[PDB]
Amino acid sequence: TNYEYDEASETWPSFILTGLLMVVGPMTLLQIYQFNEEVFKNLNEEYTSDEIKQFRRKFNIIIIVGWILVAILLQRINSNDAQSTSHGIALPRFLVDGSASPLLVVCYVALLGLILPYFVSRWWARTQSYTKKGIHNVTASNFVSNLVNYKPSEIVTTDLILHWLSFAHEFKQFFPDLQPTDFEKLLQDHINRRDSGKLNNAKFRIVAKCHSLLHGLLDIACGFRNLDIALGAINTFKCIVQAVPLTPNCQILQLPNVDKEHFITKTGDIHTLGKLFTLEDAKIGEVLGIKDQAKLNETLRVASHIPNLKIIKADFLVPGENQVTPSSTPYISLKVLVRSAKQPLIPTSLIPEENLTEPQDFESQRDPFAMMSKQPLVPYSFAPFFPTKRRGSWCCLVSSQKDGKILQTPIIIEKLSYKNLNDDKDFFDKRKHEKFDINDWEIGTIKIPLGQPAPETVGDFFFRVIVKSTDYFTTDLDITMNMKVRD
């Protein structure tokens, strides 16, 4: 016991004072510190549901506190007036040996010996339980099995995949009350926009998690090489998003307001936003059957602001060099554009191509993808029937024709630019060259690696690559290409 413990009570408090004032300082200073053009954040409330609002919304001062303690203790110590070596500690002796000493020690030993191990154990179990993409191990297992034991004899259908998604074990956790046998029907009534029973909140949380669930399954089925399966997953994802069953005219059923059955009966030939814009402004709304200037304006605007793509210079690259070579690692390059069925058929000639081809700033020439990652994100989507506000999303995926089987992890792309759609440039219509900003049209560059490298042989080997738009039945893009090994 070579140490004193200052029962004199005129030593410590200054300690805790500073030992916590230096804690509070940074909080104080850090607090007192004090690009794209979205369209639908203001609007989507025009077509949400009140229950959706309710659900999405129903599912810094300790600074000042400490400063008050500063004042208290300052005034306290000031009111207090006040060979030779000493081993002096701060804390008052009564805490050392007083009757509260058993209390303190058992408190400490409880704290470490139980709070820590219990907490870290819980934490580690719950982490280890997941996968590396947010999905739970049992769900992963089930999808993997469900797929492998799936004889490809059957053909995929939105109903089938939803049946698979019945087995969301995380769901079964959060809803121990009911059965995936029901969850299927719930999904169905939902996807038909029709109301469920008492379980509106339920289905809301359901679709909320269904997003990530579907992404995970897309991943593992793709890595498992069943294109049809992956493509069906993406279709069904668009379906869950826009709350519509997959139908060969749903290109127009993704609209905010349509005369569903009436319009079906009246017209069925029209499956293109172009065909929509093709006819007359008064006439298109006449066909629709809403007869309101406000509603027609809303619909024209929103349909003007759903994207579309079109290939421009889709080919391969290899960094540094410029010629494909045997046993190499190329990567897909395609600098494409965004349209909305309003500015069609821009000649590749009518770009100088100087603004297009990649520069050669060396490190960039080694590290690709920087120039694209410079671009902004994609704005929010519109889906009424999805609970939250969600950005867009693009999937790109690759397909060798020797088998038709996918041949990598599918790649998400969500860094883009839609400014080529704003009404500032609306003057270009479908009804040629008059006061147009030739160098305001961005050129959306997409650069997609290839996991498995080039072959060792030589030839003109053929691929098919496809970019599918999530959240939108718009003009997704499907192309082939090939590659000539030269050596």
Partner: protein, 391 residues
Amino acid sequence: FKPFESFLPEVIAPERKVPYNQKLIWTGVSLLIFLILGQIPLYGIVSSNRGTLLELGVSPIITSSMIFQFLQGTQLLQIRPESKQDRELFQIAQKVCAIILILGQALVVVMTGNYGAPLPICLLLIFQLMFASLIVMLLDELLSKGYGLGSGISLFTATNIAEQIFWRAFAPTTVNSGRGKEFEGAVIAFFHLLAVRKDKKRALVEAFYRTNLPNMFQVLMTVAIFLFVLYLQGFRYELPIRSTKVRGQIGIYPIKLFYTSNTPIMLQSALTSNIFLISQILIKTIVYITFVLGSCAVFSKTWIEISGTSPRDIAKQFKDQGMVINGKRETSIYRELKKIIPTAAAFGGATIGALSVGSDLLGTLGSGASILMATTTIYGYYEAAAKEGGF
């Protein structure tokens, strides 16, 4: 016995790639075990890491490691870099010799320390120390096994030194003589004086000119040199390499200033220790400063390749990797490397020597050596985190 039979407690391998978050959490808990073991009293002591439950600390693993490093720098056992059983037997021998050290130095401390058997309770205490060291051993096993970040021992060293800095700076220990109580926590006494006495400017500048114990001036210089040396980190001489075997494979080879990684200071310290200690047991300013200059110069220009990264070494290695210099001539590598490597080496040495002597002059709160050791440790940790992708 080059092979042997496995009747030891071994650690499970990381089943898969383990992500940044969990790695960090593992480091957290492992360091916590380390610290709590470092600040727990023992059972058998009646008199005055000193005298702690881990007084010995990590000496067993430290030895085993450097022992085998020296013995394979001589290349005694003729290790073959082809199998898995090779590294298997490697670590096997490491742990077994470790265990023997445990038992040995254990009974040593029992006899040496004036404890005295009065009698089996001493066996109980020797068990306790054995198991403590064994725990630390398998703990570093898991850390550098993949769950951690690598060299939990260098981690621990970084702790002890940084912890030491903050303890000296903020600790609530006080002595009293003449002017009342004085805490050795730098900021502690600082704000104490700030509160209790008048003549605000006089008290400030006076504790500033604290002729006796660590100053506000001291800690300010400490954080200064700290952020400055961190700034010196980076400074990486890049160079464009281009593959030749697997075409298209591009890359950047960086050459960090501290290519040697502080080893010069370890060496110059070792030599001065051998000199002055044994000398006194059995202005010159310019002398000592130019001395550290020359010492780091030479120790770089030797450690460079006695490590095994020479111009010729790295050049043959590049032939193994089939990697041309991008933008220059194929065999021009060796000439360019002969140019670059030793220059940057001796310059890093001179810089670190300058930093060390500036530290010792300013009297900053800790050993410049320790400072740079910990900073390079955690900086490498960052670099792993970044080159992979970190949250």
